[PDB]
């Protein structure tokens, strides 16, 4: 019977490779004071001065090896769960390997992730009844696809996908900056309100298995 959720779980090698790249990006935001000051300000505003390690702040992360979620099923209880799981494409894809393209890394006051750009084949596994469709209104299907690398202590890692969409909505408008500058792996954008996106000069391909997770 049905899992807590379905998704693509990264292999040991790829999970550590993405983990490290996330870490380094947090350290770059934290090592340069233009960047840290602004993130620290939309995190804590005018709270008592306090030291902040971004890698520590984003220490919380959903259980299990790193993953890109498709459908939350809650063991059959969530809406659309049986209809998702009965699909031949899902049955067929279970236990099989995929490669996920990571196009960007992003951080907000609530979360740290990697944007996934799904192939057309992988989109056949993307559900069509996701919550808040207004949030991705006018964006291609599969826009919120992501791997959550960390989130702040009182944030549900589901927030990560909404944070990504919000960034993609702003960049569809053009309220993206010109890049604040270059980092080793690409152009860095300050979108405002403590939101940062690193657009990778070259996409990272990470290996993963499509399967189900139990709690």
Residue numbers in the entry: 164 to 378
Show me the paper's own sentences about this structure.
2′,3′-cyclic nucleotide 3′-phosphodiesterase (CNPase), one of the proteins predominantly expressed in the myelin sheath, represents 4% of total protein in central nervous system myelin. CNPase belongs to the 2H phosphoesterase superfamily, which is characterized by the presence of two conserved HxT/Sx motifs (x denoting a hydrophobic residue) in the active site. CNPase contains an N-terminal domain very distantly related to P-loop containing nucleoside triphosphate hydrolases and a C-terminal phosphodiesterase domain. We solved the crystal structure of the C-terminal catalytic phosphodiesterase domain of mouse CNPase in the presence of active-site ligands, including reaction products.
